[PDB]
Design a protein around this ligand. Structure first.
Ligand SMILES: [Zn+2]
Ligand SMILES: [Zn+2]
Ligand SMILES: [Zn+2]
Ligand SMILES: [Zn+2]
Lengths: 60, 60
């Protein structure tokens, strides 16, 4: 089981509960946790390994 | 095969490829695709089935 380093809750792959994300570096998060973190910084930086993915993170 | 309805490219979770997301409804996207979509509306609404997840989608 993997835990989200942002909220410290378990990230669960099953359907029912909270949406999830898996970064290109392999670290996993809840979708709203990592999305809010990307929004605060404006880049897709992993809060764990600090790697920055060169995606297209847009606000609108 | 899993296709992202937003950009129509394959969603490949198990790879050093683009980051991916799985919504609570089961639908899968690229993280930047679905992140940018949620950012336009402020709501975690699946564009495929229109279900709304009551998460905390923050901009800062
Ligand atoms: Zn979390
Ligand atoms: Zn990482
Ligand atoms: Zn996409
Ligand atoms: Zn859906």
């Amino acid at each position: 089981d993997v835990s989200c380093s942002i909220c410290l809750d378990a990230v669960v792959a099953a359907g029912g509960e909270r949406s999830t994300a898996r970064l290109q570096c392999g670290h996993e998060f809840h979708l709203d946790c990592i999305g809010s973190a990307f929004n605060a910084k404006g880049v897709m930086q992993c809060p764990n390994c600090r790697k920055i993915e060169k995606g297209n993170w847009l606000y609108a």
